[PDB]
Amino acid sequence: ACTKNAIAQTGFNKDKYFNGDVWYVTDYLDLEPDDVPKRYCAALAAGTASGKLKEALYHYDPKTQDTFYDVSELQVESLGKYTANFKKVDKNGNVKVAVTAGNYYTFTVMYADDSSALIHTCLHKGNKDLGDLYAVLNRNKDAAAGDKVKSAVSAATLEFSKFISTKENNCAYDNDSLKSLLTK
Ligand code: FDE
């Protein structure tokens, strides 16, 4: 189960974060660490599409090759904190699993600048038991975490040393499909 009420960035700039571009997960921390593999690839696009706040997600397990994309229209709880009922889609936006009740994640932007961010998520999916998952994001898939985002990790009373890097997994991303999925 999730246990954290993550605090959104003071002065969060929504239009900059939700600009239609891609964010790569470079490091992550699950508080129930067996919930996610030790090796992983994820990325997201975030933007407004025809007036609707959207995210598109990509997950890839570099060992098993399990792949999936998702799309959500985000609802606002407050500036920088969102709830997102998701649908599983192929890379072209064709629905594989429809939106339903009980399938949603919360999403809080704890820190962001133009190039890096720290988020918290809490996934709810059916009867699964999932925990708090923090992710360091960058606009450049290869960027080492800089001092601004690492300081934000400390300010959330977390230790960056505990985060697991995605950088040694040979992750390759389809940026084009993430951007187009925003419209779907
Ligand atoms: C490492 C990592 C990282 C991440 C990130 C993320 C973010 C930022 C967000 C998210 C979300 C999500 N996820 Fe995530 N992630 C991960 C992981 C994961 C996994 C393993 C899974 C599967 C689960 C189950 O089903 O059990 C997921 C999962 C997930 C999901 C679901 C999808 C479907 O369709 O089913 C979602 C919605 N993810 N995510």
GROMACS .gro file of C-alpha atoms in nm, residues 1-63:
model
   63
    1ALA     CA    1   0.000   0.000   0.000
    2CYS     CA    2   0.102   0.359  -0.038
    3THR     CA    3   0.193   0.557   0.265
    4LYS     CA    4   0.308   0.901   0.150
    5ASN     CA    5   0.127   1.224   0.090
    6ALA     CA    6   0.389   1.376  -0.137
    7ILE     CA    7   0.409   1.753  -0.138
    8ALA     CA    8   0.402   1.929  -0.476
    9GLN     CA    9   0.667   2.179  -0.571
   10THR     CA   10   0.603   2.530  -0.444
   11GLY     CA   11   0.541   2.741  -0.752
   12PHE     CA   12   0.513   2.440  -0.986
   13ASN     CA   13   0.501   2.557  -1.351
   14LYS     CA   14   0.241   2.337  -1.509
   15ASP     CA   15   0.271   2.466  -1.864
   16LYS     CA   16   0.645   2.399  -1.870
   17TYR     CA   17   0.609   2.044  -1.735
   18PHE     CA   18   0.307   1.963  -1.951
   19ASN     CA   19   0.463   2.098  -2.272
   20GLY     CA   20   0.413   1.789  -2.486
   21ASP     CA   21   0.771   1.665  -2.458
   22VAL     CA   22   0.922   1.345  -2.323
   23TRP     CA   23   1.062   1.274  -1.975
   24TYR     CA   24   1.286   0.973  -1.914
   25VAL     CA   25   1.305   0.792  -1.581
   26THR     CA   26   1.674   0.780  -1.488
   27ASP     CA   27   1.641   0.653  -1.129
   28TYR     CA   28   1.361   0.518  -0.912
   29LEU     CA   29   1.280   0.424  -0.555
   30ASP     CA   30   0.989   0.198  -0.460
   31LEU     CA   31   0.915   0.187  -0.092
   32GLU     CA   32   0.792  -0.172  -0.134
   33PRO     CA   33   1.112  -0.264  -0.336
   34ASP     CA   34   1.001  -0.615  -0.449
   35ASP     CA   35   0.706  -0.448  -0.630
   36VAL     CA   36   0.924  -0.352  -0.925
   37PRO     CA   37   1.214  -0.537  -1.088
   38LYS     CA   38   1.573  -0.437  -1.013
   39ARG     CA   39   1.623  -0.358  -1.383
   40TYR     CA   40   1.375  -0.141  -1.581
   41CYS     CA   41   1.305   0.121  -1.855
   42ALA     CA   42   1.024   0.384  -1.830
   43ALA     CA   43   0.939   0.715  -1.990
   44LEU     CA   44   0.643   0.946  -2.021
   45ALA     CA   45   0.515   1.237  -2.233
   46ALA     CA   46   0.303   1.500  -2.064
   47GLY     CA   47   0.102   1.772  -2.234
   48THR     CA   48  -0.231   1.931  -2.310
   49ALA     CA   49  -0.411   1.790  -2.614
   50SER     CA   50  -0.723   1.967  -2.737
   51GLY     CA   51  -0.768   2.128  -2.397
   52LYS     CA   52  -0.729   1.800  -2.198
   53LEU     CA   53  -0.437   1.731  -1.962
   54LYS     CA   54  -0.271   1.405  -2.073
   55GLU     CA   55   0.010   1.167  -2.010
   56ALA     CA   56   0.139   0.884  -2.218
   57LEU     CA   57   0.350   0.617  -2.050
   58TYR     CA   58   0.596   0.356  -2.166
   59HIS     CA   59   0.732   0.066  -1.959
   60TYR     CA   60   0.985  -0.197  -2.066
   61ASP     CA   61   1.149  -0.475  -1.872
   62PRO     CA   62   1.491  -0.509  -2.033
   63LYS     CA   63   1.529  -0.873  -1.927
   0.00000   0.00000   0.00000
